[PDB]
Amino acid sequence: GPLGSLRKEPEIITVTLKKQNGMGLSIVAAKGAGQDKLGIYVKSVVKGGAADVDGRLAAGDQLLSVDGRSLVGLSQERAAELMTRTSSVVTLEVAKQGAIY
Ligand SMILES: O=C1N=C(S)S[C@@H]1Cc1ccc(C(F)(F)F)cc1
């Protein structure tokens, strides 16, 4: 598949270990259980990591796929298990919604 570079649109995004101190990011998935909703979201950067300081992701980015795993819309229990081991770069797929405020 193709890949861009940087733009404020729904796409593949990739986040290198620029300063090696882990990624330092924050995500939340949902499921089709207790509420009807499903999905994944970048809740924040963690204000202290390599993918935080040089990836500078936005609060609210609706995540869909994960490094080594093209999920296209499935919950973190089969994806954050891969992302945590990354050691060098997360590829991701996201869609800009919400803001900091
Ligand atoms: O903050 C973190 N950096 C890591 S390395 S593991 C931990 C949890 C975490 C993993 C991946 C993501 C990401 F890449 F944003 F999906 C968020 C949080």
Side-chain angles (χ1 to χ4, degrees):
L3 61 89
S5 192
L6 59 104
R7 242 171 294 273
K8 257 66 187 182
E9 80 192 328
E11 216 193 301
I12 192 178
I13 296 191
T14 188
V15 228
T16 54
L17 278 275
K18 178 70 175 304
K19 194 149 282 170
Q20 300 97 327
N21 195 63
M23 286 127 59
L25 296 176
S26 185
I27 51 100
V28 178
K31 281 180 290 195
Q35 287 96 75
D36 62 298
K37 299 180 185 182
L38 190 57
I40 331 165
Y41 301 90
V42 181
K43 180 158 172 163
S44 68
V45 296
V46 179
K47 188 178 166 183
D52 147 77
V53 76
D54 216 38
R56 297 168 285 251
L57 305 185
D61 297 342
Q62 183 179 276
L63 197 162
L64 296 176
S65 298
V66 149
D67 201 87
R69 299 187 183 153
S70 39
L71 334 164
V72 303
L74 300 174
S75 315
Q76 63 76 52
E77 30 274 272
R78 302 186 187 82
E81 180 274 337
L82 198 297
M83 297 195 298
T84 303
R85 301 197 195 91
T86 290
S87 306
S88 60
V89 52
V90 264
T91 58
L92 302 175
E93 182 182 49
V94 305
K96 214 296 149 277
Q97 292 178 113
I100 303 175
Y101 291 118

